Amino acid sequence: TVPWFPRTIQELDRFANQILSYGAELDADHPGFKDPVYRARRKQFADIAYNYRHGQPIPRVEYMEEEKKTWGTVFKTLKSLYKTHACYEYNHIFPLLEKYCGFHEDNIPQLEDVSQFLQTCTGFRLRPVAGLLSSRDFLGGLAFRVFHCTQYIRHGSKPMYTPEPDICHELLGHVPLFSDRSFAQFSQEIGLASLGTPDEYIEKLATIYWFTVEFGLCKQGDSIKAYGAGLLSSFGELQYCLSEKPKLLPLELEKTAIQNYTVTEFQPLYYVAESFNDAKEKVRNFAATIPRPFSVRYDPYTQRIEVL
Ligand SMILES: C[C@H](O)[C@H](O)C1CNC2=NC(N)=NC(=O)C2=N1
Ligand SMILES: [Fe+3]
Numbered sequence: 001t002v003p004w005f006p007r008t009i010q011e012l013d014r015f016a017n018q019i020l021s022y023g024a025e026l027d028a029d030h031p032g033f034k035d036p037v038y039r040a041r042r043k044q045f046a047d048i049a050y051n052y053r054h055g056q057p058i059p060r061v062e063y064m065e066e067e068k069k070t071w072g073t074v075f076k077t078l079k080s081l082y083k084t085h086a087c088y089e090y091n092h093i094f095p096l097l098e099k100y101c102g103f104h105e106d107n108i109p110q111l112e113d114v115s116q117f118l119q120t121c122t123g124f125r126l127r128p129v130a131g132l133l134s135s136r137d138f139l140g141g142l143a144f145r146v147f148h149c150t151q152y153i154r155h156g157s158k159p160m161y162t163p164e165p166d167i168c169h170e171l172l173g174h175v176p177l178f179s180d181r182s183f184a185q186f187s188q189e190i191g192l193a194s195l196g197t198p199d200e201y202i203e204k205l206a207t208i209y210w211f212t213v214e215f216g217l218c219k220q221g222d223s224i225k226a227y228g229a230g231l232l233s234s235f236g237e238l239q240y241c242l243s244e245k246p247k248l249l250p251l252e253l254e255k256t257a258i259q260n261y262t263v264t265e266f267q268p269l270y271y272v273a274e275s276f277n278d279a280k281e282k283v284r285n286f287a288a289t290i291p292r293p294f295s296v297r298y299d300p301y302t303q304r305i306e307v308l
Contacts, residue, residue, distance in 0.1 A: 002293070003136070005195040009144045009303040010054045015137045016130060023131040024164045031163075032155030045152035049130040058112040058128055058151075066156050072105040073159040074168040077235050085238050087218040087225035089180040089276070093121075097176060109171060111151055118147075118175065122184035123300060132164075135206040136199070142191025143298055143305060147178060160235060173229030174213075182276035183227070187213055189280045192296050193287035195305065201290045204257040208286070211256050212279055217241060217248065217272045224248070224272060237266045246270055251279055253286040 006012050024030055025042045032038035041064075048059050063071075082091060097103040101113050111126050118124040122145065129148035133141075141148050149170045154162035162169065177183045190213070194205050215228035224242065231238050240246065249255075251271040261267060273279040295308040 002196045005140055007305050009146065012141055012144060012146055013054050015133055016050050018137060019130050020132050031158040035155065038155050042152050046130040048151060049128040052128050058115060060110045060112060063108045067153045068106060068108055070153055070156045070159045071108045071168055075105045078172055081238050085226055085242055086232055087220055087227040089183060090176045090227065093176045093179045108167065111149060114171065114175060118178050121179040122181055124178040124184055136194060136202045139191055139194040139205055142187050143195055145184060145188055147174065169233040173233035177227055186276040186280035189283040192298065193283055193290065195296045196292055197290055207259065208253060208257050210261060211271045212273060215267055215270060217270045219272055219274050240266050241270055248272055251282060253282050
């Protein structure tokens with residue numbers, strides 16, 4: 001049989017009912033494990049994602065002073081690096097995010113405003129997500145230019161560290177790239193490649209995503225920069241990834257897709273994308289080798305996936 005996959009953007013709503021119910025915030029070694037207030041705060045954000053439905057505006061939340069502080073620290077220390085470490089598409093859009101979305105040290109931007117802004121850039125939109133989606137559902141959203149975005153923030157005791165995605169990582173890491181046309185199309189190709197795809201291949205697509213969307217390096221003229229969200233949201237690894245220590249290889253999907261990695265230390269290896277259009281092409285070609293007895297196309301006019 002062929003695994004189920006949403007045919008319309010509205011059907012993404014089926015995901016919030018298929019997430020991991022026991023999140024990392026419940027682990028003993030989580031920075032906020034002993035903090036019951038944090039625990040309730042997380043549950044509150046999880047309830048917002050749980051009751052969200054496609055088409056609804058995303059609930060605004062008044063962030064506590066302590067939370068705004070954690071964001072300030074992460075924002076200020078990371079910002080100093082972008083001008084020289086982030087790829088062009090990132091820097092080109094960051095100022096706009098600053099003027100129209102409240103990207104500032106003393107303010108945590110609201111997902112609704114960020115979503116509207118991405119919509120006018122590339123049609124990308126966000127939807128609040130409770131916790132970790134399966135790779136199949138997470139990647140599936142991308143086919144509709146939809147990004148499941150966390151809304152809670154890491155625990156204030158360790159501002160420069162998070163064992164999971166949190167809002168600082170979504171906004172400072174992912175958002176600027178989804179504002180770029182080429183990147184938008186490239187990430188969508190990954191989404192399209194995953195629809196109705198067999199599990200073993202979903203894993204391959206997750207690995208490609210890891211080495212591009214999360215930890216990718218781009219070729220910029222004769223230089224190299226970071227575009228991977230996991231890098232753009234990690235002060236330490238962002239500086240390291242452009243140093244002489246890591247090993248760099250050109251993005252090559254048959255190899256990238258089976259390359260192991262661990263999410264615990266700095267990556268020993270990075271793949272360099274020639275450009276987003278090229279990575280997009282490479283995914284399309286790679287998608288062609290996936291055994292699916294059909295083809296898929298997203299029609300932005302109706303927000304439906306066409307199955308051939
Ligand atoms: C895309 C790849 O499978 C990643 O490991 C995943 C899986 N599920 C996910 N779920 C959520 N909510 N956010 C993510 O960034 C995410 N990334
Ligand atoms: Fe991420």
